[PDB]
Design a protein around this ligand. Structure first.
Ligand SMILES: OC[C@H]1O[C@@](CO)(O[C@H]2O[C@H](CO)[C@@H](O)[C@H](O)[C@H]2O)[C@@H](O)[C@@H]1O
Length: 207
């Protein structure tokens, strides 16, 4: 099944992502609200691009049931940033890091080429992450740094009642997605690329 193969093919990349110095220090309480805010600013950039690609692919008629609009984060994230930054000034202030430029470039290639299988790979890596370790991240931003949960809306999925149930549903959708042999190979390859982009985002954030 695709869901298992995806999890296995990306296991090494997941571990490397999880143990990046920036993410490691952030989660262990060794940084601060400021760094979490820098992370969320960069995320707003790549989620904006991700969700444009999602919009394109869904509109094209591919992976429709997987591409649940309830997952959209860009507007929720903008409200978090308004809270974290104390105004909407950040919008005209933020600059993409070199890793984010590469990530956004890939996502815009996917969008404009309407590369459905690639988009699914990117969707899995980000959204299943948010529904998973993202829950731990939100808890630890509050506990380590006193971030108000009003500024952690990113990690809350309105009108998803049960996260584990949702993820099992998601994995079943992956398993039933019709793919040619090369589309499947491409999806798997792109999933590891997606993890590597995130690794590079964290590396730039650590400096
Ligand atoms: O579980 C998430 C993800 O982590 C991986 C590799 O990083 O597995 C590691 O962590 C698991 C628990 O979270 C352990 O059971 C496993 O032994 C360890 O390698 C991936 O396999 C997994 O999808």
């Amino acid at each position: 099944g695709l869901a298992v193969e995806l999890k296995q093919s990306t296991a090494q990349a997941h571990e490397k992502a999880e143990h990046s110095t920036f993410m490691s220090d952030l989660l262990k309480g060794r940084l601060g609200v400021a760094e979490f805010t820098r992370l969320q600013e960069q995320a707003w950039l790549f989620y904006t691009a991700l969700e444009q690609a999602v919009d394109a692919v869904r509109a094209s008629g591919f992976a429709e049931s997987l591409l649940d609009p309830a997952l959209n984060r860009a507007e929720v994230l903008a409200r978090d940033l308004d809270k974290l930054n104390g105004s909407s000034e950040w919008r005209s202030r933020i600059t993409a890091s070199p890793a984010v430029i590469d990530y956004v470039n890939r996502l815009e290639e996917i969008r404009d080429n309407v590369d459905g299988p690639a988009l699914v790979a990117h969707h899995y890596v980000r959204y299943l992450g948010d529904l998973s370790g993202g829950q731990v991240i939100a808890r630890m931003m509050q506990r380590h740094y006193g971030v108000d949960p009003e500024a952690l809306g990113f990690y809350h999925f309105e009108g998803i009642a049960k996260l584990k149930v949702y993820k099992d549903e998601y994995r079943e959708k992956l398993n039933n997605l019709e793919l040619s042999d090369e589309q499947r190979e491409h999806l798997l390859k792109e999933a590891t690329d997606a993890f590597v982009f995130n690794h590079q985002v964290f590396a730039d954030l650590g400096k």
